[PDB]
Amino acid sequence: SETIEGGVKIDRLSPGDGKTFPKQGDLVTIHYTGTLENGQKFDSSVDRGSPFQCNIGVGQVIKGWDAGIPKLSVGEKARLTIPGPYAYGPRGFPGLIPPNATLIFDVELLKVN
Numbered sequence: 199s200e201t202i203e204g205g206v207k208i209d210r211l212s213p214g215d216g217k218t219f220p221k222q223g224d225l226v227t228i229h230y231t232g233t234l235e236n237g238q239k240f241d242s243s244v245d246r247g248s249p250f251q252c253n254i255g256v257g258q259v260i261k262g263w264d265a266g267i268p269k270l271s272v273g274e275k276a277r278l279t280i281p282g283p284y285a286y287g288p289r290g291f292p293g294l295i296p297p298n299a300t301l302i303f304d305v306e307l308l309k310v311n
Protein backbone atom coordinates (compact mmCIF):
# COMPACT_ATOMS: atom_id res chain seq x y z
CA SER A 199 0.00 0.00 0.00
CA GLU A 200 1.35 3.49 -0.82
CA THR A 201 0.69 6.06 1.92
CA ILE A 202 0.16 9.53 0.53
CA GLU A 203 -1.17 12.87 1.80
CA GLY A 204 -3.17 12.65 4.99
CA GLY A 205 -2.38 9.02 5.43
CA VAL A 206 -4.61 8.12 2.47
CA LYS A 207 -3.61 4.74 1.05
CA ILE A 208 -3.49 3.65 -2.57
CA ASP A 209 -3.66 -0.02 -3.53
CA ARG A 210 -2.96 -0.41 -7.22
CA LEU A 211 -5.43 -2.91 -8.77
CA SER A 212 -4.84 -2.79 -12.52
CA PRO A 213 -2.57 -0.57 -14.55
CA GLY A 214 -3.26 2.57 -16.59
CA ASP A 215 -1.05 3.81 -19.44
CA GLY A 216 1.59 4.87 -16.92
CA LYS A 217 2.00 8.24 -18.57
CA THR A 218 -1.19 10.32 -18.67
CA PHE A 219 -1.75 11.65 -15.14
CA PRO A 220 -4.19 14.37 -14.15
CA LYS A 221 -2.81 17.84 -13.38
CA GLN A 222 -4.27 20.56 -11.27
CA GLY A 223 -7.58 21.76 -12.72
CA ASP A 224 -7.92 18.91 -15.26
CA LEU A 225 -11.35 17.43 -15.86
CA VAL A 226 -11.28 13.79 -14.86
CA THR A 227 -13.90 11.16 -15.70
CA ILE A 228 -14.03 8.38 -13.09
CA HIS A 229 -16.15 5.41 -12.21
CA TYR A 230 -16.24 4.64 -8.51
CA THR A 231 -17.76 2.48 -5.79
CA GLY A 232 -17.63 3.73 -2.23
CA THR A 233 -17.79 1.50 0.84
CA LEU A 234 -17.37 1.93 4.56
CA GLU A 235 -14.65 0.01 6.40
CA ASN A 236 -17.07 -2.83 7.16
CA GLY A 237 -17.43 -3.30 3.40
CA GLN A 238 -21.00 -1.87 3.22
CA LYS A 239 -21.48 0.03 -0.08
CA PHE A 240 -22.84 3.56 0.21
CA ASP A 241 -22.66 4.70 -3.43
CA SER A 242 -21.54 3.82 -6.90
CA SER A 243 -21.42 5.80 -10.17
CA VAL A 244 -21.55 2.41 -11.95
CA ASP A 245 -25.00 1.72 -10.49
CA ARG A 246 -26.15 5.05 -12.11
CA GLY A 247 -24.66 4.14 -15.44
CA SER A 248 -22.92 7.46 -15.56
CA PRO A 249 -19.27 8.18 -14.85
CA PHE A 250 -18.48 10.97 -12.39
CA GLN A 251 -16.65 14.08 -13.55
CA CYS A 252 -14.81 16.75 -11.60
CA ASN A 253 -11.86 19.10 -11.90
CA ILE A 254 -9.19 17.70 -9.66
CA GLY A 255 -7.04 19.62 -7.22
CA VAL A 256 -9.42 22.52 -6.55
CA GLY A 257 -11.58 21.40 -3.69
CA GLN A 258 -14.65 20.18 -5.62
CA VAL A 259 -14.30 16.81 -3.92
CA ILE A 260 -13.11 15.45 -0.62
CA LYS A 261 -9.43 15.86 0.19
CA GLY A 262 -8.65 12.23 -0.26
CA TRP A 263 -9.77 12.35 -3.88
CA ASP A 264 -7.73 15.48 -4.56
CA ALA A 265 -4.77 13.61 -3.06
CA GLY A 266 -5.25 10.26 -4.74
CA ILE A 267 -6.62 10.84 -8.20
CA PRO A 268 -3.56 12.72 -9.56
CA LYS A 269 -1.44 9.68 -8.81
CA LEU A 270 -3.42 7.50 -11.26
CA SER A 271 -2.92 7.29 -15.01
CA VAL A 272 -5.62 6.90 -17.65
CA GLY A 273 -7.19 3.46 -17.52
CA GLU A 274 -5.92 2.67 -14.06
CA LYS A 275 -8.03 0.98 -11.37
CA ALA A 276 -7.03 1.58 -7.77
CA ARG A 277 -8.43 1.51 -4.26
CA LEU A 278 -8.24 4.66 -2.15
CA THR A 279 -8.58 4.24 1.60
CA ILE A 280 -9.33 7.68 3.04
CA PRO A 281 -9.25 8.50 6.77
CA GLY A 282 -11.99 10.65 8.27
CA PRO A 283 -10.10 13.98 8.17
CA TYR A 284 -9.61 13.59 4.41
CA ALA A 285 -13.27 12.61 3.91
CA TYR A 286 -16.31 13.83 5.88
CA GLY A 287 -14.73 14.28 9.31
CA PRO A 288 -16.80 14.37 12.51
CA ARG A 289 -19.91 15.42 10.65
CA GLY A 290 -20.34 12.63 8.14
CA PHE A 291 -23.09 12.80 5.51
CA PRO A 292 -26.74 11.95 6.32
CA GLY A 293 -27.84 8.46 5.41
CA LEU A 294 -24.49 7.53 3.84
CA ILE A 295 -21.40 8.33 5.91
CA PRO A 296 -21.16 8.09 9.74
CA PRO A 297 -19.02 10.46 11.84
CA ASN A 298 -15.28 9.93 11.58
CA ALA A 299 -15.55 7.28 8.90
CA THR A 300 -12.68 5.90 6.90
CA LEU A 301 -13.95 5.42 3.34
CA ILE A 302 -12.87 2.96 0.70
CA PHE A 303 -13.25 3.97 -2.96
CA ASP A 304 -12.56 1.67 -5.84
CA VAL A 305 -11.87 4.08 -8.69
CA GLU A 306 -11.23 3.75 -12.43
CA LEU A 307 -9.73 6.73 -14.22
CA LEU A 308 -11.51 6.69 -17.58
CA LYS A 309 -10.40 9.98 -19.14
CA VAL A 310 -8.36 13.13 -18.52
CA ASN A 311 -9.00 16.52 -20.08
Ligand SMILES: C=CC[C@@H]1/C=C(\C)C[C@H](C)C[C@H](OC)[C@H]2O[C@@](O)(C(=O)C(=O)N3CCCC[C@H]3C(=O)O[C@H](/C(C)=C/[C@@H]3CC[C@@H](O)[C@H](OC)C3)[C@H](C)[C@@H](O)CC1=O)[C@H](C)C[C@@H]2OC
Binds near residue numbers: 240291294
Ligand atom coordinates in the same frame (compact mmCIF):
# COMPACT_ATOMS: atom_id res chain seq x y z
C1 LIG B 1 -24.10 20.53 -4.89
C2 LIG B 1 -24.84 19.45 -4.23
C3 LIG B 1 -25.01 18.13 -4.93
C4 LIG B 1 -23.73 17.71 -5.66
C5 LIG B 1 -23.93 16.30 -6.09
C6 LIG B 1 -23.37 15.77 -7.33
C7 LIG B 1 -22.66 16.66 -8.31
C8 LIG B 1 -23.54 14.30 -7.63
C9 LIG B 1 -22.30 13.52 -7.20
C10 LIG B 1 -22.19 12.23 -8.01
C11 LIG B 1 -22.31 13.25 -5.69
C12 LIG B 1 -23.06 11.98 -5.29
O1 LIG B 1 -24.43 12.11 -5.60
C13 LIG B 1 -25.04 10.88 -5.90
C14 LIG B 1 -22.86 11.61 -3.82
O2 LIG B 1 -21.55 11.11 -3.71
C15 LIG B 1 -21.25 10.49 -2.49
O3 LIG B 1 -22.11 9.36 -2.28
C16 LIG B 1 -19.82 10.01 -2.69
O4 LIG B 1 -19.55 8.70 -3.05
C17 LIG B 1 -18.73 10.84 -2.50
O5 LIG B 1 -18.22 10.84 -1.22
N1 LIG B 1 -18.16 11.58 -3.44
C18 LIG B 1 -18.65 11.57 -4.82
C19 LIG B 1 -17.51 11.22 -5.77
C20 LIG B 1 -16.32 12.14 -5.52
C21 LIG B 1 -15.86 12.06 -4.07
C22 LIG B 1 -16.99 12.39 -3.10
C23 LIG B 1 -17.32 13.85 -3.12
O6 LIG B 1 -16.27 14.69 -2.86
O7 LIG B 1 -18.47 14.31 -3.37
C24 LIG B 1 -18.67 15.74 -3.37
C25 LIG B 1 -19.11 16.19 -2.01
C26 LIG B 1 -20.38 15.65 -1.41
C27 LIG B 1 -18.28 17.17 -1.31
C28 LIG B 1 -18.63 17.74 0.03
C29 LIG B 1 -19.08 19.18 -0.15
C30 LIG B 1 -19.41 19.82 1.20
C31 LIG B 1 -18.19 19.77 2.11
O8 LIG B 1 -18.54 20.31 3.38
C32 LIG B 1 -17.66 18.35 2.28
O9 LIG B 1 -16.48 18.38 3.04
C33 LIG B 1 -16.31 17.20 3.78
C34 LIG B 1 -17.40 17.67 0.93
C35 LIG B 1 -19.71 16.15 -4.43
C36 LIG B 1 -19.26 15.69 -5.80
C37 LIG B 1 -20.00 17.66 -4.45
O10 LIG B 1 -18.93 18.38 -5.02
C38 LIG B 1 -21.19 18.01 -5.34
C39 LIG B 1 -22.54 17.73 -4.76
O11 LIG B 1 -22.65 17.47 -3.40
C40 LIG B 1 -21.43 11.47 -1.32
C41 LIG B 1 -21.26 10.80 0.04
C42 LIG B 1 -22.78 12.18 -1.41
C43 LIG B 1 -23.02 12.74 -2.81
O12 LIG B 1 -24.31 13.29 -2.89
C44 LIG B 1 -24.37 14.60 -2.38
